[PDB]
Amino acid sequence: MDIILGIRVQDSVILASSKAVTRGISVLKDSDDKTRQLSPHTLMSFAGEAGDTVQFAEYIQANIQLYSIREDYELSPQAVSSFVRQELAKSIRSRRPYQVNVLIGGYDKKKNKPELYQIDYLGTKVELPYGAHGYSGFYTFSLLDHHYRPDMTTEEGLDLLKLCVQELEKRMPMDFKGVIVKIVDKDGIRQVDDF
Amino acid sequence: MDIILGIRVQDSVILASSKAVTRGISVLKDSDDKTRQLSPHTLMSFAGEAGDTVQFAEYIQANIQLYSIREDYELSPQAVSSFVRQELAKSIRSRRPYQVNVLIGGYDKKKNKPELYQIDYLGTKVELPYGAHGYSGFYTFSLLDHHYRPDMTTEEGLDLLKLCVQELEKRMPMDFKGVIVKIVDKDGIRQVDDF
Amino acid sequence: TSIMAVTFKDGVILGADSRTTTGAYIANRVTDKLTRVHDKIWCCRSGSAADTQAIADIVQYHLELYTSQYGTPSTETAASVFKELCYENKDNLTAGIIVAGYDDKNKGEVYTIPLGGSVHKLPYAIAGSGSTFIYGYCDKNFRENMSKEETVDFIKHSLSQAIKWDGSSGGVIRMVVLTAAGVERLIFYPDEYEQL
Amino acid sequence: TSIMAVTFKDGVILGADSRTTTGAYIANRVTDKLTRVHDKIWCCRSGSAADTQAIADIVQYHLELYTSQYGTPSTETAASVFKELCYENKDNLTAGIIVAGYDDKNKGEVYTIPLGGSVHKLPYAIAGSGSTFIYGYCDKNFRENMSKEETVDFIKHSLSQAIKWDGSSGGVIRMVVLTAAGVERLIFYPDEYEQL
Amino acid sequence: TTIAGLVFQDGVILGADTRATNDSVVADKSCEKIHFIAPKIYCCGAGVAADAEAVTQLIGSNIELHSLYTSREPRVVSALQMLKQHLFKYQGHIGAYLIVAGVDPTGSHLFSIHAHGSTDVGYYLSLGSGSLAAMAVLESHWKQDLTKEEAIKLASDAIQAGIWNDLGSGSNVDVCVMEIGKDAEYLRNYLTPNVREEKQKSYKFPRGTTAVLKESIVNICDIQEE
Amino acid sequence: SDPSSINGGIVVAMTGKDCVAIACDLRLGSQSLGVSNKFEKIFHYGHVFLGITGLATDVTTLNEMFRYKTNLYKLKEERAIEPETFTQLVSSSLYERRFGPYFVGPVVAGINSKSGKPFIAGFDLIGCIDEAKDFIVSGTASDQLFGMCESLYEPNLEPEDLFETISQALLNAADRDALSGWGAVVYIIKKDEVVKRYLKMRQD
Amino acid sequence: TQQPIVTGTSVISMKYDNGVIIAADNLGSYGSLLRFNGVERLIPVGDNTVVGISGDISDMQHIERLLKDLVTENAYDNPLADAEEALEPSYIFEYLATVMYQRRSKMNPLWNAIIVAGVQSNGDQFLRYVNLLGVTYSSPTLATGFGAHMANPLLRKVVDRESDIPKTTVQVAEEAIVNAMRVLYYRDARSSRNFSLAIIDKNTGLTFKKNLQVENMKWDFAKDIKGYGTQKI
Amino acid sequence: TTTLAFRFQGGIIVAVDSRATAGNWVASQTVKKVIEINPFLLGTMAGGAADCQFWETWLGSQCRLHELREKERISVAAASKILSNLVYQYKGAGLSMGTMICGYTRKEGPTIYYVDSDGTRLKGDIFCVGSGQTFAYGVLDSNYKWDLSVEDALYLGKRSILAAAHRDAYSGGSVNLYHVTEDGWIYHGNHDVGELFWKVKEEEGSFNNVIG
Amino acid sequence: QFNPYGDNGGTILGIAGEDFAVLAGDTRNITDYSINSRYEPKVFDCGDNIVMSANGFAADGDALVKRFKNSVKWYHFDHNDKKLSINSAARNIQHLLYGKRFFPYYVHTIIAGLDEDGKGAVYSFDPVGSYEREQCRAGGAAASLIMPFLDNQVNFKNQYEPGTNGKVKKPLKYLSVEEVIKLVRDSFTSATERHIQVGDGLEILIVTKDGVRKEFYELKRD
């Protein structure tokens, strides 16, 4: 899977993820959602090797959903990201490692703060104001370095994201067929249907 | 260079050639003309290894232009294509071969007939009603097999070409940034500026 | 390495050079390659020093435990235990061992165990890198039922030539004599054997 | 291949086996490896048959042209021409040649030219795959100024052992005697030399 | 391929099978592996068929010009020396393995030549994938002072051993006899032990069975003239 | 990677009573992609016919080369080249590129104009001649053609029978090869008339 | 996976009217070194079977012990061990063939080619081959290694098909085997002059011949051969 | 190999070719690349022939066990996921598979799932899989609409395989057609390309590149 | 490095008639350019009116046939001496072959017999167990030579009714056992001429409702 972006603004986290699924010669699908809801206020986008991506995402989803039922309580985004990191860090020394990079965007209901975690397939975790995986960051980080402010609104965050996607559509060789955008805030997770 | 198409209709030859120039990570240009006018009624589009493509095209152009001045006469498209084929066939057993595939579209003023020749880097020449190089043909030949007729007008040829380009834009992974289209007929060569 | 065991009238004699090399450096110039697995069953080691020492230590253990249960083992029995280890672990070993021993019933016996882990009972045996240079000499000069003094001279002359031509061989010529009389160690220095 | 040249009182004798192999198949069991580059300058060939034949043919040409201009060439001169070809084309040749010849002034002389293209003047020389097995034997048994009959026996016994142990060597033992008297060819069959 | 050569009382004889192969398929069932060099000098070839053919033809051409120049019958040693020096030059890349035999003023001769440029002298020789089958027969039955009748029998037997027991070799037996003071006799298809048996059916089709789209006459002549 | 099987295609030639037949498929491809269904592989220089399979750039190059050489031959000799002589010219020209060969499988077919004798020949890529009495095969379905020819063929077939035999040999061989087919052409050659027939075959 | 170290060369064999003959030289080679000159490679099993083995000698010595152990095991609780329940050639072969194929299938082969020659209970000749791959086949003549290339062509001239077996006597068959062993000594660089030969006959039983030598060898023609082309002296 | 399946107003069309190859050798022209799992479920086969047969036959057994245990027809989603989870266990071992699981259930409606041997599982409206997929896609995407007649949709699927059978060297033989509805799948015949091609050429006026 | 596979050559051929089936195979066994045996049976009667051959690497072929014969034996024990139908045998063979998917049996397998309606049946397998029922199938070294011929002569491919222009195909017919054996013999005679690994002898097993019959024919020994 190709491009996954994340940006943490004042009161929300915004995850943008490409729609293309390419198997070699042909583009098999142009509407693929590269994300799973782990809990009501925590969303994980993912990209990497075919099969491994979805298998890993759904495996994480099942474990967090199991935790939620057992304790009747939602884990913090920090806790979920640490769980995910450990699973990837365990994976890298396995017989066959998961080749999956993830972004975890969550709203911590205790602290009333949005949180964005970037974790690569090795289990390298970092909390960031904005993040990306693969070649996306090469184009988009210079923009985000320039335009980002911590006190941005969600609408300003989306405009800044449009500028990232336009730059990617101009300069990347692969046609990633646009992005599905999702916002994570105090009210939960919703999809921006027009982007 | 990626996609080059050619279609010979009733009274003209239409060549469509992608605008993107990609060097690895970035798309350096989105308006590149992958063609040279060899003579007033003969156009050659080209695609292959960087540097070799233009070097070869301009070398052919210079030789045909030299012939035209010496004899005060335009070579037939058949004669130009045979010259080009021999140069590529000579090339393939060289120290360093030209990695260049070409289409030669021409209007033969003697016979009053459009002619389209497809020549690959090995020096494999074929006269065709429609042709392509690289992965383009995998998508476009099935369309052209279905929709092509030998008595089509130039406008019908362009509509059929739009259908080819739409299919390529849907199913190819690379963003080739659209095509420059050129028509070769009895009046010479002209560019369709809106496509 | 140049090693050999030779049967004769009164029993058997094992002989060896004393050079151990790591490439062209002589790591040990006074090595003892004649090693005891039982009172009157000895062996000559060639190949990987680690492997032959590891094997010889295991054999010595097996024959010690054999002796506690069933009394003195035959030389054939010792050669079989060597073979079993060498054959079953042929993929992980580089060992070329000559087994020599004295019974009162069987007298002197010599068994050679090359790389594959096969066993060959012989009147005499030669092995190691330096042995290639003395096949011709040893074949022409060996006789059966030699005396002790003749067999010592046969081994001394043989290993002298092996040492002369093989860079991997050298130092002192050690020998171990196995007879009814007991176990005798002999040593011969360069100034003696080089002038032969 | 087992080849050797031995100087003695009256001159020099070249000796060789007759086996040529392509892997384990004996392509020719009656090969003549003793080859004439001049009336009384011969050579023993080992290595690539194509290469040694190509070299020997060129040397014979050079010494023929030398003789037309400057009279009979020395054995040293012949060895030098062999060396020049072997050394300058060392990257494309696999040739191990022993050169042996008789002058009246210098008497018997032997020069060995191994793979590198170096030259070595020696009292006797051995070469080929089978020579490894007789370094010990030849060193112990060679004497200077032997008679013709002693030198024939020395070569016969030596190559007999080389043949016995080396699979690449075998067949008949050919010999060429070089003296003031002339050039004598000798041949010795398996039934003679095997029982030695 | 099974090629062989052996000497007899006042001559030399060459034998060869007639099968050419490309991997596991039989390209040719009747090929001539006994190449012509001079009127009384012949060459059996194994290895790469194009190479064996080309090298014998080239040396044969040069031998003819040499013979004209010197006004002499060509010698087998001349063909031998020219073949080996050519083959040596190319370092085995011309993969030709040859048995050269012939008669000249010096006498009768028999040599073998390898692709790398080495040569052998022998009283009986064999080369190719069937050499071991042939040599087994030659080692069992060859003796000194064979008559011509015994020599043809032994040569053809040696080739047959290859034909039956070697997959590389097959079909027919070609022989060439070169005897002193006589014309060389070349005996193609000397034996024919592998004729195909009659087929069970005839697969000749009813006419019109094949569907045809177009027909036309091809003009092969020069200028149809007025 | 193997040059002889990039483009694909086949040629077969047969002898009959006072006649020869040579036939070929029409496919030119880039491995799996079919490119042209009009790529003829049989050419003629006077009354001598040459079929060529293998790498298509060399097929075209060699055709142009033998046209060149037979044109000069005719100007100097003042007669058309014969099949036996042309066979030797093909062999020569192939072998002179011994260590950088044309990746082709040529097939000569024709009738000697003086003796009236039917003649066919085949070559490997470096010029070794196979001069068959019965038939010659070449191309990516050469194994298939060998199987068809070896069972279907019988000697001394009349021209119109020989047509049926060679056509069925080509068609059924081509249908078992991925890289052959897409149409076919058969030449029936007699001493002073030559008929050319395009065959109807499955277009996959 | 290993490589063979000490090796034995050709084993040759054929059927004749009343039984089978098998032969093999007494050499254990160590590459090009002709190391061991007293190695018996024909191993009898009872009085009706001989197993001839080529290839790796350490793996041969293992197989030798398996067959020795098989005879012991057959005798256990078997009053007819020396009669109707004695080991047959076909039982011995099928056991070996099972072992050979199992070992190749674990990628750890016994690096050998084996010929089991014998006579069955009903007088039928048994002759079958098996190798390191578990490949098996039977034929009126069988040979391993160089024998396949040189011996079989000679032996097939005597018995070319099944119908030639009743016409071939033991004298003709043994003669053919002895000649084949001479040919192999001329031409196989990893062979020896000394060999063993075994005849298993349905009437006269097992005759095991040790310390045979190749004799009547033609070398005399060698004296006349001079140089490699142009040399006259 | 060319397989395709697409969703439309009147259900699902499934069309496949019939050729099997070993390199450039045409092993067979009469191969079945559609597996009938039950009256409402179909499976297409691309990639390794054995891998597809074995595991899609096995899939049918697992789908049968589901309905014995749950007294209910297995969902297309569940059936596709049994196969995708299986192949994922074997990932890296070298299985070669491209497949579509096509069926109707009341809860899902008509559904198509693409499953492959590197573990990908995708739901979608249109899929083409195999060496001739690009050729099929060309024809299919151009004439695809949601609201074709069942007769027109069946023709398009047939025609798309024909297009691929022509151009792709490794595709051919014959076209097998299926139509999946509320009531189940319906076979719409085996159509030999050697007859279909010429029929389509004449009636449609396409394939003008060919000598006809 | 040790290579566990080899190639023993040979060629086999199955043809399904109306109320019979044949499975033929040459009797030559080879390695490289040497003949191992001129008569080594390759086609076997497996019981229950089923004949089988696994051509390619003979050790894997023998192993597979041995295992299938044993599978028939245990099918009788476990299911009250029920006759193993040819379709059931075929599926069982798929599982034997696929069981070694990652270390395959290097063989092309063909079985022949009668289906449960009494009609002739041939089944054909690749080395890892993919199978199809066919009217016609050659396997092994000369399969490329033989199969196009069978397409033409058994299934009447590319053959049209004369005078119909090319629009009525030759209609499909079942062949008589005598006709099939003529086509089998001519296939192998042809294959022997042009393939070096085919020759020596031809053994044909014919399966009818009455049982399994054998026929043997000489082939060229070069």
Ligand SMILES: *[C@@H](CS(C)(=O)=O)[C@H](Cc1ccc(CN)cc1)NC(=O)[C@H](COC)NC(=O)[C@H](CC(C)C)NC(=O)c1cnc(C)s1
């Ligand atoms: C037997 C040689 S063997 C098996 O190596 O012992 C024959 C000898 C031979 C000599 C001369 C002629 C004709 N004047 C024919 C045959 N050689 C062959 O069968 C050789 C293959 O041996 C390895 N055949 C060829 O070389 C063939 C050409 C014939 C079919 C006409 N060519 C090739 O196979 C190829 C050449 N280059 C390739 C790439 S493939």
Ligand SMILES: *[C@@H](CS(C)(=O)=O)[C@H](Cc1ccc(CN)cc1)NC(=O)[C@H](COC)NC(=O)[C@H](CC(C)C)NC(=O)c1cnc(C)s1
């Ligand atoms: C086409 C797939 S492709 C390469 O994308 O064009 C077909 C699809 C297919 C699906 C189902 C069946 C049911 N029997 C058949 C075919 N696949 C094949 O043709 C594959 C292609 O190679 C991967 N062929 C094979 O799997 C062949 C089948 C034999 C019947 C020829 N087997 C092999 O190639 C093997 C080679 N070595 C083996 C061990 S298996």
Ligand SMILES: [Mg+2]
């Ligand atoms: Mg020897």
Ligand SMILES: [Mg+2]
């Ligand atoms: Mg085809």
Ligand SMILES: [Mg+2]
């Ligand atoms: Mg196709």
Ligand SMILES: [Mg+2]
């Ligand atoms: Mg044959």
